[PDB]
Short mmCIF file of C-alpha atoms in Angstrom, two decimals:
data_model
loop_
_atom_site.label_atom_id
_atom_site.label_comp_id
_atom_site.label_asym_id
_atom_site.label_seq_id
_atom_site.Cartn_x
_atom_site.Cartn_y
_atom_site.Cartn_z
CA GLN X 1 0.00 0.00 0.00
CA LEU X 2 1.34 3.42 -1.05
CA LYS X 3 -0.09 6.78 0.06
CA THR X 4 1.35 9.94 -1.53
CA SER X 5 0.69 13.43 -0.14
CA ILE X 6 1.90 16.79 -1.48
CA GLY X 7 2.28 19.94 0.61
CA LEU X 8 3.44 23.54 0.44
CA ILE X 9 6.03 25.15 2.74
CA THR X 10 4.92 28.80 2.71
CA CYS X 11 7.44 31.19 4.23
CA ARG X 12 7.75 34.82 5.29
CA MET X 13 10.62 37.03 6.31
CA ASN X 14 9.16 38.62 9.40
CA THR X 15 10.27 42.24 8.86
CA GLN X 16 10.39 42.80 12.65
CA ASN X 17 12.88 40.07 13.74
CA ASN X 18 14.67 39.49 10.44
CA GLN X 19 13.95 35.76 10.87
CA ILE X 20 12.40 33.32 8.39
CA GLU X 21 9.08 31.78 9.40
CA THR X 22 6.83 29.10 7.90
CA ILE X 23 3.10 28.35 8.05
CA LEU X 24 2.38 25.35 10.28
CA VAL X 25 -0.98 23.93 11.37
CA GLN X 26 -1.75 22.18 14.65
CA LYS X 27 -4.15 19.24 14.57
CA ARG X 28 -7.51 19.42 16.32
CA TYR X 29 -7.53 15.82 17.58
CA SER X 30 -4.99 13.08 18.17
CA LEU X 31 -4.33 10.12 15.91
CA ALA X 32 -5.06 7.83 18.86
CA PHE X 33 -8.60 9.17 19.29
CA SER X 34 -9.22 8.73 15.56
CA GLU X 35 -7.80 5.18 15.52
CA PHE X 36 -10.06 4.24 18.43
CA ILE X 37 -13.19 5.82 16.95
CA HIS X 38 -12.59 4.15 13.58
CA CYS X 39 -11.89 0.75 15.21
CA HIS X 40 -8.28 0.44 14.07
CA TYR X 41 -7.39 -1.67 17.10
CA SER X 42 -7.57 -5.28 18.22
CA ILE X 43 -10.01 -6.04 21.02
CA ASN X 44 -8.07 -9.32 21.35
CA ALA X 45 -4.80 -7.46 21.87
CA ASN X 46 -4.89 -7.48 25.65
CA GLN X 47 -4.82 -4.56 27.84
CA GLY X 48 -1.47 -2.72 27.79
CA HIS X 49 -1.48 -2.42 23.99
CA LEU X 50 -4.90 -0.74 23.92
CA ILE X 51 -3.79 1.11 27.04
CA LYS X 52 -1.05 2.92 25.12
CA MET X 53 -3.60 4.13 22.60
CA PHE X 54 -5.74 5.44 25.43
CA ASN X 55 -2.56 6.95 26.93
CA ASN X 56 -1.86 8.82 23.68
CA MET X 57 -5.25 10.54 23.63
CA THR X 58 -5.79 13.95 25.16
CA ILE X 59 -7.56 14.25 28.50
CA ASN X 60 -10.61 15.82 26.84
CA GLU X 61 -10.80 12.95 24.35
CA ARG X 62 -10.68 10.42 27.20
CA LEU X 63 -13.41 12.36 29.03
CA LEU X 64 -15.47 12.13 25.84
CA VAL X 65 -14.93 8.37 25.63
CA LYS X 66 -15.96 8.05 29.28
CA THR X 67 -19.44 9.33 28.39
CA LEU X 68 -20.04 6.11 26.38
CA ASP X 69 -21.96 8.37 23.95
CA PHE X 70 -20.53 7.41 20.55
CA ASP X 71 -22.45 10.25 18.88
CA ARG X 72 -20.51 12.89 20.85
CA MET X 73 -17.20 11.13 20.16
CA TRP X 74 -18.06 11.01 16.44
CA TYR X 75 -19.05 14.70 16.39
CA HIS X 76 -15.68 15.58 17.94
CA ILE X 77 -13.98 14.38 14.73
CA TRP X 78 -16.55 14.73 11.95
CA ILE X 79 -18.59 17.80 13.06
CA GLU X 80 -21.88 16.71 11.44
CA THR X 81 -20.13 15.81 8.18
CA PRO X 82 -22.52 13.56 6.21
CA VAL X 83 -20.82 10.15 6.47
CA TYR X 84 -23.73 8.11 7.81
CA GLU X 85 -22.71 4.70 6.42
CA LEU X 86 -19.18 4.95 7.83
CA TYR X 87 -20.64 6.26 11.09
CA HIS X 88 -23.09 3.35 11.35
CA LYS X 89 -20.40 0.73 10.75
CA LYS X 90 -17.99 2.26 13.27
CA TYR X 91 -20.78 2.77 15.82
CA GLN X 92 -21.83 -0.88 15.61
CA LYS X 93 -18.21 -1.97 16.01
CA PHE X 94 -17.88 0.31 19.06
CA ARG X 95 -20.96 -1.06 20.80
CA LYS X 96 -20.02 -4.66 19.95
CA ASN X 97 -16.57 -4.07 21.46
CA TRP X 98 -17.58 -2.04 24.51
CA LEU X 99 -21.35 -1.88 25.14
CA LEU X 100 -22.81 -5.35 24.58
CA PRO X 101 -20.22 -7.34 26.61
CA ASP X 102 -20.67 -5.30 29.81
CA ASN X 103 -22.38 -1.93 29.06
CA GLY X 104 -19.04 -0.14 29.08
CA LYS X 105 -17.49 -1.39 32.32
CA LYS X 106 -14.18 -2.60 30.88
CA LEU X 107 -13.96 0.47 28.64
CA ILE X 108 -14.55 2.80 31.59
CA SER X 109 -11.97 0.90 33.66
CA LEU X 110 -9.38 1.19 30.87
CA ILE X 111 -10.23 4.88 30.35
CA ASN X 112 -9.84 5.55 34.08
CA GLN X 113 -6.54 3.70 34.48
CA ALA X 114 -5.09 5.35 31.35
CA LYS X 115 -2.16 7.60 32.25
CA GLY X 116 -0.70 10.71 30.69
CA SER X 117 -1.93 12.40 27.55
CA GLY X 118 -1.08 12.68 23.88
CA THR X 119 0.05 15.72 21.95
CA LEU X 120 -1.64 17.51 19.06
CA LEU X 121 0.79 17.45 16.13
CA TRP X 122 2.15 20.46 14.29
CA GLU X 123 2.32 19.70 10.58
CA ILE X 124 2.93 21.17 7.16
CA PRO X 125 -0.40 21.34 5.28
CA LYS X 126 -0.67 18.57 2.69
CA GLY X 127 -3.18 16.22 1.13
CA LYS X 128 -3.72 13.59 -1.50
CA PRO X 129 -3.84 14.66 -5.16
CA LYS X 130 -7.17 14.46 -6.96
CA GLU X 131 -7.68 12.38 -10.08
CA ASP X 132 -4.83 13.09 -12.51
CA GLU X 133 -4.07 16.41 -10.82
CA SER X 134 -0.51 17.69 -11.02
CA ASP X 135 1.60 17.91 -7.87
CA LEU X 136 1.99 21.69 -7.74
CA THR X 137 -1.72 22.22 -8.38
CA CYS X 138 -2.52 19.74 -5.60
CA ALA X 139 -0.19 21.42 -3.10
CA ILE X 140 -1.67 24.84 -3.88
CA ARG X 141 -5.27 23.62 -3.69
CA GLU X 142 -4.71 21.76 -0.40
CA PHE X 143 -2.84 24.73 1.09
CA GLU X 144 -5.80 26.99 0.30
CA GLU X 145 -8.24 24.34 1.54
CA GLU X 146 -6.56 24.03 4.94
CA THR X 147 -5.27 27.55 5.63
CA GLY X 148 -7.50 29.70 3.41
CA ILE X 149 -4.41 31.42 1.95
CA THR X 150 -4.91 31.99 -1.77
CA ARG X 151 -2.31 32.03 -4.54
CA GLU X 152 -2.51 35.86 -4.49
CA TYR X 153 -0.43 35.88 -1.29
CA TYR X 154 2.67 33.99 -2.44
CA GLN X 155 5.01 33.10 -5.29
CA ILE X 156 6.12 29.51 -5.83
CA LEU X 157 9.88 29.04 -6.08
CA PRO X 158 9.88 26.11 -8.52
CA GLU X 159 13.47 24.90 -8.08
CA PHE X 160 12.75 23.52 -4.58
CA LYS X 161 11.14 20.10 -4.25
CA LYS X 162 11.69 17.84 -1.24
CA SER X 163 10.54 14.22 -0.94
CA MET X 164 10.35 12.18 2.27
CA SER X 165 9.54 8.49 2.69
CA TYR X 166 8.27 6.73 5.81
CA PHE X 167 7.24 3.13 6.38
CA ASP X 168 4.60 2.17 8.95
CA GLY X 169 4.79 -1.56 8.30
CA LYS X 170 2.60 -2.21 5.28
CA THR X 171 1.78 1.33 4.05
CA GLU X 172 4.59 3.39 2.51
CA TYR X 173 4.02 7.15 2.93
CA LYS X 174 5.65 9.57 0.49
CA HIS X 175 5.44 13.31 1.23
CA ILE X 176 6.33 15.89 -1.45
CA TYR X 177 6.91 19.54 -0.56
CA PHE X 178 7.11 22.64 -2.75
CA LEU X 179 8.35 26.01 -1.47
CA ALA X 180 6.53 29.35 -1.56
CA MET X 181 7.51 32.87 -0.53
CA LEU X 182 5.01 35.39 0.83
CA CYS X 183 4.51 38.25 -1.65
CA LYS X 184 1.72 40.05 0.33
CA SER X 185 1.28 40.89 4.01
CA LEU X 186 -0.33 38.23 6.23
CA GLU X 187 0.29 39.00 9.91
CA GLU X 188 -2.36 36.77 11.57
CA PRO X 189 -2.88 33.50 9.68
CA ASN X 190 -4.84 32.09 12.63
CA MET X 191 -7.69 34.48 11.88
CA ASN X 192 -8.47 32.42 8.77
CA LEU X 193 -9.72 29.68 11.13
CA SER X 194 -13.48 30.11 11.51
CA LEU X 195 -16.29 27.63 12.04
CA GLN X 196 -17.96 28.95 8.87
CA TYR X 197 -15.17 27.25 6.86
CA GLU X 198 -15.84 23.56 7.53
CA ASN X 199 -12.74 22.35 5.68
CA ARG X 200 -10.29 24.62 7.52
CA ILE X 201 -11.34 23.61 11.05
CA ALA X 202 -12.00 19.99 10.03
CA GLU X 203 -8.57 18.84 11.24
CA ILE X 204 -6.95 22.11 12.36
CA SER X 205 -7.04 23.87 15.73
CA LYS X 206 -4.47 26.62 15.05
CA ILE X 207 -2.49 28.23 12.21
CA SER X 208 0.71 30.06 13.09
CA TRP X 209 3.94 31.43 11.72
CA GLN X 210 6.86 29.47 13.17
CA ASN X 211 10.55 30.35 13.03
CA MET X 212 13.29 27.71 13.04
CA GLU X 213 13.61 27.91 16.82
CA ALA X 214 9.92 27.04 17.17
CA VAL X 215 10.25 24.25 14.59
CA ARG X 216 13.06 22.65 16.61
CA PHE X 217 11.24 23.14 19.92
CA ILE X 218 8.08 21.46 18.59
CA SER X 219 9.98 18.72 16.76
CA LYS X 220 11.75 17.61 19.93
CA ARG X 221 8.36 17.29 21.71
CA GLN X 222 6.22 15.40 19.17
CA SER X 223 6.46 12.27 17.04
CA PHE X 224 6.67 14.20 13.76
CA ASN X 225 10.16 15.64 13.15
CA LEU X 226 9.72 18.81 11.07
CA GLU X 227 13.36 19.96 11.09
CA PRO X 228 14.56 17.72 8.19
CA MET X 229 11.91 19.41 6.01
CA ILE X 230 11.96 23.02 7.18
CA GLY X 231 15.76 23.10 7.37
CA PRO X 232 16.41 22.75 3.63
CA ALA X 233 13.49 25.09 2.90
CA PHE X 234 14.97 27.87 5.05
CA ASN X 235 18.39 27.16 3.54
CA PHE X 236 16.91 27.68 0.07
CA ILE X 237 15.18 30.87 1.28
CA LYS X 238 18.50 32.23 2.57
CA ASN X 239 20.19 31.51 -0.77
CA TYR X 240 17.28 33.14 -2.62
CA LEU X 241 17.50 36.24 -0.41
CA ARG X 242 21.27 36.57 -0.81
CA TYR X 243 20.70 36.80 -4.58
CA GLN J 1 -11.34 42.95 45.64
CA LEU J 2 -8.21 40.83 46.10
CA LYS J 3 -7.84 37.20 45.01
CA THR J 4 -4.85 35.38 46.50
CA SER J 5 -3.49 32.10 45.14
CA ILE J 6 -0.55 30.17 46.58
CA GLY J 7 1.53 27.71 44.59
CA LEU J 8 4.61 25.50 44.74
CA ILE J 9 7.57 25.68 42.34
CA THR J 10 8.93 22.13 42.32
CA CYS J 11 12.36 21.75 40.75
CA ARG J 12 14.70 18.96 39.73
CA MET J 13 18.27 18.72 38.48
CA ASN J 14 18.15 16.54 35.36
CA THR J 15 21.07 14.17 35.96
CA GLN J 16 21.55 13.52 32.23
CA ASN J 17 21.94 17.06 30.83
CA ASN J 18 22.57 19.00 34.07
CA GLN J 19 19.64 21.34 33.47
CA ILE J 20 17.30 22.62 36.16
CA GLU J 21 13.63 21.88 35.44
CA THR J 22 10.33 22.83 37.08
CA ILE J 23 6.90 21.22 37.10
CA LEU J 24 4.44 23.14 34.91
CA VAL J 25 0.82 22.26 34.12
CA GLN J 26 -1.11 23.11 30.96
CA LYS J 27 -4.76 24.09 31.30
CA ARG J 28 -7.48 21.88 29.86
CA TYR J 29 -9.79 24.69 28.70
CA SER J 30 -9.50 28.38 27.90
CA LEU J 31 -10.48 31.21 30.23
CA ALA J 32 -12.81 32.53 27.51
CA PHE J 33 -14.81 29.29 27.43
CA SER J 34 -15.14 29.34 31.24
CA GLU J 35 -16.21 33.00 31.26
CA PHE J 36 -18.88 32.28 28.64
CA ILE J 37 -20.16 29.20 30.47
CA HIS J 38 -20.36 31.14 33.75
CA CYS J 39 -21.89 34.25 32.08
CA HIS J 40 -19.01 36.61 32.84
CA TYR J 41 -19.96 38.79 29.88
CA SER J 42 -22.47 41.50 28.93
CA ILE J 43 -25.22 40.47 26.46
CA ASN J 44 -25.76 44.17 25.65
CA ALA J 45 -22.19 44.35 24.31
CA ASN J 46 -21.61 45.48 20.79
CA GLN J 47 -20.73 42.62 18.49
CA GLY J 48 -16.93 42.90 18.75
CA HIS J 49 -17.00 42.72 22.55
CA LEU J 50 -18.32 39.14 22.45
CA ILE J 51 -16.32 38.56 19.28
CA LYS J 52 -13.10 38.76 21.29
CA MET J 53 -14.29 36.28 23.91
CA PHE J 54 -15.36 33.81 21.22
CA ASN J 55 -12.09 34.44 19.36
CA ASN J 56 -10.01 33.42 22.37
CA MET J 57 -11.71 30.04 22.77
CA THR J 58 -10.29 26.95 21.14
CA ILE J 59 -11.91 25.56 17.99
CA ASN J 60 -13.21 22.55 19.92
CA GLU J 61 -14.80 24.85 22.50
CA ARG J 62 -16.57 26.83 19.77
CA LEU J 63 -17.79 23.59 18.18
CA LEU J 64 -19.19 22.65 21.59
CA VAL J 65 -20.99 26.00 21.88
CA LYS J 66 -22.38 25.50 18.36
CA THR J 67 -24.37 22.43 19.49
CA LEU J 68 -26.49 24.71 21.76
CA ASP J 69 -26.46 21.78 24.24
CA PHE J 70 -25.53 23.48 27.51
CA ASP J 71 -25.07 20.11 29.22
CA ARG J 72 -22.20 19.17 26.90
CA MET J 73 -20.57 22.58 27.34
CA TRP J 74 -20.97 22.22 31.11
CA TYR J 75 -19.50 18.71 31.04
CA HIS J 76 -16.41 20.07 29.27
CA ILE J 77 -15.54 22.03 32.42
CA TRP J 78 -17.17 20.26 35.37
CA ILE J 79 -17.18 16.58 34.24
CA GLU J 80 -20.43 15.63 36.04
CA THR J 81 -19.24 17.15 39.29
CA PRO J 82 -22.44 17.56 41.35
CA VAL J 83 -22.92 21.35 41.34
CA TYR J 84 -26.58 21.55 40.39
CA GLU J 85 -27.27 24.88 42.11
CA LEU J 86 -24.61 26.76 40.14
CA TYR J 87 -25.49 24.75 37.03
CA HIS J 88 -29.14 25.82 37.31
CA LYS J 89 -28.18 29.49 37.63
CA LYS J 90 -25.75 29.40 34.69
CA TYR J 91 -28.08 27.32 32.51
CA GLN J 92 -30.89 29.78 33.17
CA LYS J 93 -28.68 32.70 32.17
CA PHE J 94 -27.61 30.82 29.03
CA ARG J 95 -31.23 30.00 28.18
CA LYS J 96 -32.36 33.61 28.64
CA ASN J 97 -29.43 34.99 26.64
CA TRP J 98 -29.27 32.59 23.73
CA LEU J 99 -32.20 30.13 23.59
CA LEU J 100 -35.40 32.06 24.41
CA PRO J 101 -34.98 35.09 22.07
CA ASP J 102 -34.45 33.10 18.84
CA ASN J 103 -33.63 29.41 19.59
CA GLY J 104 -29.91 30.07 19.25
CA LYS J 105 -29.73 31.88 15.91
CA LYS J 106 -27.67 34.90 17.00
CA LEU J 107 -25.43 32.67 19.12
CA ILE J 108 -24.82 30.34 16.16
CA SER J 109 -24.09 33.32 13.90
CA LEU J 110 -21.64 34.72 16.48
CA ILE J 111 -19.94 31.33 16.92
CA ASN J 112 -19.59 31.07 13.13
CA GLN J 113 -18.10 34.51 12.46
CA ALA J 114 -15.55 34.29 15.30
CA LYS J 115 -12.00 34.03 13.95
CA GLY J 116 -8.80 32.47 15.28
CA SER J 117 -8.32 30.47 18.46
CA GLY J 118 -6.95 30.95 21.95
CA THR J 119 -4.02 29.22 23.63
CA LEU J 120 -4.05 26.92 26.65
CA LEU J 121 -1.81 28.45 29.31
CA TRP J 122 1.14 26.78 30.97
CA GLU J 123 1.04 27.55 34.69
CA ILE J 124 2.61 26.84 38.04
CA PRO J 125 0.03 24.93 40.13
CA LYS J 126 -1.69 27.16 42.66
CA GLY J 127 -5.04 27.68 44.34
CA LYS J 128 -6.93 29.61 46.97
CA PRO J 129 -6.15 28.94 50.65
CA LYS J 130 -8.80 27.42 52.88
CA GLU J 131 -10.08 29.13 56.03
CA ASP J 132 -7.34 29.34 58.69
CA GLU J 133 -4.93 27.60 56.31
CA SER J 134 -1.31 28.72 56.22
CA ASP J 135 0.32 29.71 52.94
CA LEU J 136 2.75 26.78 52.82
CA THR J 137 0.01 24.29 53.75
CA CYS J 138 -2.16 25.63 50.93
CA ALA J 139 0.69 25.42 48.42
CA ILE J 140 1.44 21.82 49.46
CA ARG J 141 -2.21 20.71 49.36
CA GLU J 142 -2.90 22.39 46.01
CA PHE J 143 0.28 20.99 44.46
CA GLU J 144 -0.62 17.45 45.54
CA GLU J 145 -4.24 17.87 44.43
CA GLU J 146 -3.30 19.03 40.94
CA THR J 147 -0.20 16.95 40.17
CA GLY J 148 -0.58 13.94 42.48
CA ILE J 149 2.99 14.42 43.72
CA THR J 150 3.11 13.81 47.48
CA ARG J 151 5.48 15.31 50.04
CA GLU J 152 7.66 12.17 49.94
CA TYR J 153 9.03 13.38 46.61
CA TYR J 154 10.34 16.83 47.53
CA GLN J 155 12.07 18.98 50.13
CA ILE J 156 10.68 22.45 50.84
CA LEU J 157 13.29 25.21 50.70
CA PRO J 158 11.69 27.49 53.30
CA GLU J 159 13.69 30.63 52.64
CA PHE J 160 12.27 31.25 49.14
CA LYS J 161 8.94 33.07 48.85
CA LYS J 162 7.97 34.93 45.69
CA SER J 163 4.99 37.29 45.40
CA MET J 164 3.46 38.67 42.19
CA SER J 165 0.73 41.30 41.79
CA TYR J 166 -1.56 41.89 38.80
CA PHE J 167 -4.53 44.21 38.23
CA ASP J 168 -7.43 43.71 35.81
CA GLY J 169 -9.19 46.96 36.82
CA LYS J 170 -11.00 46.14 40.05
CA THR J 171 -9.71 42.58 40.51
CA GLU J 172 -6.38 42.28 42.29
CA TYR J 173 -4.42 39.05 41.79
CA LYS J 174 -1.72 38.16 44.31
CA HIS J 175 0.24 34.98 43.60
CA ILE J 176 2.55 33.51 46.25
CA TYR J 177 5.06 30.79 45.35
CA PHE J 178 7.13 28.58 47.61
CA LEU J 179 10.06 26.50 46.33
CA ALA J 180 10.65 22.75 46.56
CA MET J 181 13.47 20.52 45.31
CA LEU J 182 12.87 16.94 44.20
CA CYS J 183 14.17 14.46 46.79
CA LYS J 184 13.12 11.30 44.90
CA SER J 185 13.20 10.52 41.19
CA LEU J 186 10.13 11.31 39.05
CA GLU J 187 10.82 11.09 35.30
CA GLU J 188 7.26 11.10 33.96
CA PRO J 189 5.00 13.44 35.97
CA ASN J 190 2.43 13.38 33.15
CA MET J 191 1.60 9.77 34.04
CA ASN J 192 -0.07 11.11 37.18
CA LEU J 193 -2.83 12.43 34.87
CA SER J 194 -5.63 9.85 34.97
CA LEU J 195 -9.40 10.12 34.88
CA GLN J 196 -9.55 8.20 38.17
CA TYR J 197 -8.15 11.35 39.85
CA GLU J 198 -10.89 13.93 39.26
CA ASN J 199 -8.93 16.77 40.91
CA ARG J 200 -5.92 16.36 38.62
CA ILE J 201 -7.87 16.34 35.33
CA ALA J 202 -10.36 19.02 36.45
CA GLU J 203 -8.29 21.85 34.96
CA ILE J 204 -5.16 20.11 33.61
CA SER J 205 -4.43 18.55 30.22
CA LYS J 206 -0.68 17.95 30.67
CA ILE J 207 2.05 17.92 33.35
CA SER J 208 5.65 18.34 32.24
CA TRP J 209 9.18 19.12 33.35
CA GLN J 210 10.31 22.39 31.76
CA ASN J 211 13.83 23.80 31.68
CA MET J 212 14.60 27.51 31.48
CA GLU J 213 14.85 27.50 27.67
CA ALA J 214 11.37 25.96 27.51
CA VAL J 215 10.09 28.40 30.14
CA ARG J 216 11.26 31.35 28.02
CA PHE J 217 9.90 29.80 24.80
CA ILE J 218 6.47 29.31 26.39
CA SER J 219 6.48 32.70 28.14
CA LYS J 220 7.10 34.58 24.90
CA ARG J 221 4.09 32.78 23.32
CA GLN J 222 1.36 33.35 25.91
CA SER J 223 -0.11 36.12 28.05
CA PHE J 224 1.29 34.58 31.25
CA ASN J 225 4.99 35.42 31.71
CA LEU J 226 6.62 32.66 33.76
CA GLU J 227 10.22 33.87 33.58
CA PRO J 228 9.98 36.45 36.42
CA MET J 229 9.01 33.52 38.68
CA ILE J 230 11.16 30.64 37.42
CA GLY J 231 14.26 32.81 36.93
CA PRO J 232 14.69 33.70 40.61
CA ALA J 233 13.59 30.19 41.60
CA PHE J 234 16.28 28.56 39.47
CA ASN J 235 18.80 31.12 40.77
CA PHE J 236 17.95 30.02 44.33
CA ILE J 237 18.26 26.34 43.33
CA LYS J 238 21.66 27.06 41.75
CA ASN J 239 22.86 28.84 44.93
CA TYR J 240 21.58 25.94 47.06
CA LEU J 241 23.24 23.31 44.86
CA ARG J 242 26.68 24.90 44.60
CA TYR J 243 26.83 24.70 48.41
#
């Protein structure tokens, strides 16, 4: 299985610090919460291995699970997105796993004994290309989809392209990044996040400019290491500026 | 009116890097969400004056408000803590403000047009003293209540006391901090966060060791400046350790 995503590293020279900054987005929910809600776990894997997944949720997500109300858990991710068939299948798997055996007693025990909390990832915006869509077009479209920043605000620098490959075990993930430079003021990217734009808030809780110091700080505190991507981008930006 | 909180600055020398670190806790919900839920706002405000409160909530908090289900909003803060009297008063204010005039249409419009998102503060644990409770006793009790770290784990350094004063206009905040040094290893304080301990999760989403670099990084990214507290604390720890 191969999953290819393409993203855009959009950068600014903040005229106040004389530092280079990039647009990053923070997720709204954890991968663990999603994996649990979509039944990507083994009920027959005994406790500690489902316990880590519960450990890697946020406290609020665990408090949502403790309600045993699958509709509220689902809303947390999908926000009344019309996916009824998927919802029905996942809901029946949830109640078969956790409600019919004991009306939620083992689930509540596991939720209560779970320790710690997960972290919401900072990421570069990216998504899967549409049907026979070119890579640059896909990166631009997904960037606008997630952040609301239109092509008006930036110029692509076409000689930068960075590819990264990860393996999860059976799915190979390839991530492709273009580079863009801000050509129009945009001081507060977070203000593009509004509940009237369903696709921006769908998986995003915050949009922010981040300098290299912030990129390193975040990278050393989350599973996703952003420094091998942002590093070469900022290097390219420096070379571009010195020309 | 003066509101006094007392807290404990618990510090550790990391034996691997030789960095001094302190216990900090991250809030579970924003102050804006709490103020809305407890009706600490004026309905007769012009639009912008509620726009700022909604703007400084998280996206998830706004999505909770958008359901118009006051019980779910309430649960987000209180987690079925039995406080029916207060709940009744706040629910009645919510129902008069947002449900009875138009069945939630203006509230939904306001939730939708709000832009951006707030930030969950990192804090030193602290709380209000009980009646005829001493300052140190309050700091110790509140620290244990929030983090689950008992007195076994640390030595009070009695000769440090730090006071801070803030003004909001008629509300005076005085914060008093004692200092403690870890006297037993504790690598993963976040594992004390479990839903079986209601007082730890009530207002906390994460517990972490933070060195001075992290303290400065966080302080320059939130309204709460921790460096005027942790700086002198770490100075005291440094003086204590070199002797």
